[PDB]
Amino acid sequence: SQIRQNYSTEVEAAVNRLVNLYLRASYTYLSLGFYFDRDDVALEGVCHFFHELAHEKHEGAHRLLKMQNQRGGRALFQDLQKPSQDEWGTTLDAMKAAIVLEKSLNQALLDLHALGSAQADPHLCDFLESHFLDEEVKLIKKMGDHLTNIQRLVGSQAGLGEYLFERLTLKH
Amino acid sequence: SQIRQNYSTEVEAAVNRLVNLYLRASYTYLSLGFYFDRDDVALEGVCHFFHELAHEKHEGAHRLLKMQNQRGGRALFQDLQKPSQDEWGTTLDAMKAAIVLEKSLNQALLDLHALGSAQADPHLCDFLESHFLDEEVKLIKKMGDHLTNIQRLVGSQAGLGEYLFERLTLKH
């Protein structure tokens, strides 16, 4: 490569794996949103919430792939596994699955940051700091806030709570 | 002092104590608002309500200190005690603690007004009448209104009520 400088094969490979993780997360969110669009589920705000995240995770994959080319690494794509479930339960089940997914992405980001640090790759470290680490902290805080409000609304009137949360917290 | 006229040492000292009370109240409100911002509490309207009051109480301290200098008294600052609690319970617990705090500030204002009256200090009396006494009556009425609505919403579905009050009465 005519441009590659200070860009380890270890980082290059980890960036390709992280792209696979983001595209898998986008796919998971596509499935979550279409479940909430079912006529027998019908929670529009929940569908919109997950479809926005499907878009955000596609955009994160695109940013990683752009950076891979800016550094002179080579994008390599692998098969994308299907999401973990075909049906996603309640809004509470779905938001618990989303927080699990986001904490897995966050740990992958932190692992790649630590590899970059070990490789003395400050451009990689800055790139994750600037475009990924705070976006993930903010999203996980928002999901935790939502989980608390969903849990408070269960009581012994779960249907009522699930409707009110979708109507009065999520966007429709 | 070149400007001091009709300004007793008793009033000067009581104004400094009242400043300490207002800064303590601001601190209490800072803590109340950050509790409601926790991911395991997550009541944005409640956080906003208390943070606005933290600002209002800072502004009251600034107005007192400005008046102290306008009269030729000397601002003296003391240590600020931390708030009475680290965790504030439910919205109902927090609004009960806030009304207690506001009635303590109101009694301090009335005490200082009575001292000013005894000292034949009409500028001090006017100052409290114009900038503090009605603001306190209005705030205490608003808190009492909120307490009644929160209490009505407890029923036997406390979580539901707490969510609805934050969504439909407070600003988010």
Add this chain to the structure above:
Amino acid sequence: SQIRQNYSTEVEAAVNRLVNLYLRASYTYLSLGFYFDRDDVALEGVCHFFHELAHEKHEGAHRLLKMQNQRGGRALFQDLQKPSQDEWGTTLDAMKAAIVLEKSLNQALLDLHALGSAQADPHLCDFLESHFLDEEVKLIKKMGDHLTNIQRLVGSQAGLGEYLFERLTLKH
């Protein structure tokens, strides 16, 4: 905590201590500004300079507390000590005290950055880099610039110099 990830108890505790340091600094600046507002001091530009810093340090405390909740740590507030002096001397004395205060805040920021680095907490390190370290370097440079101009103006006409600096460098 449902959101906490990669957030050490050491960092959590150091963030709470840093909040106390920022609120103490805000209080110091409140006292500095009210001293310059005295009818027997009467340097409006100096009062404005310190009151702006009191606001900036309150805002830094709020940003730290917001981040503490975003990471799933728990805000804990302690008593706030009163400022070190009741009267602040000349503009030169006050700007020397301010530079001492700012270098203490800067060292606390650098200490917390080093703890974050040792704890492999890149979100904390980025957070300080993005919102605190350069703001502190810029403020300390501005204070050093002011100190040089104040010192140049003392000569053997100190009152004249103190007036001219407040009129022609500070904002009124």
Add this chain to the structure above:
Amino acid sequence: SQIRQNYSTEVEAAVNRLVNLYLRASYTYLSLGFYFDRDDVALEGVCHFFHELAHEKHEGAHRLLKMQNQRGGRALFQDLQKPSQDEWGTTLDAMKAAIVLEKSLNQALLDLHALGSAQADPHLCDFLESHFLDEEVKLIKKMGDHLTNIQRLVGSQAGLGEYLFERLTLKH
């Protein structure tokens, strides 16, 4: 009188005396301003400062006389003594004479407020609180601020200081 209610002869007489005091103060300020307009004094900002106060004191007399008629009292005018000096010395001498004058007006206001209080005349007490007491406190604080800045500028270069104060603090 068809309108007079709760308006003592004592207050009526004291309001007429206070009108005389305000018109005397206006006259004093007219003389102060014309002294500073002399070609051998030539401090335009000082002339403007005093002429604005001559206008303010005329307006206070007009407000008192309007209130006297609103209450059903009878305006009675007496001779107006000339000002205490024909020449007013330095800006410092003049601002010291002005503070003395303002403290005499302030004590007259406070005396009339106390008479109103003794006479259970709350409209009179409110009237002074609303239109006179804080205006006087604010003006005396401004004059004290000016006195400190003038004093700081004397040094051993009095002419220089007097010019700089008129140029950089007063309005021309």
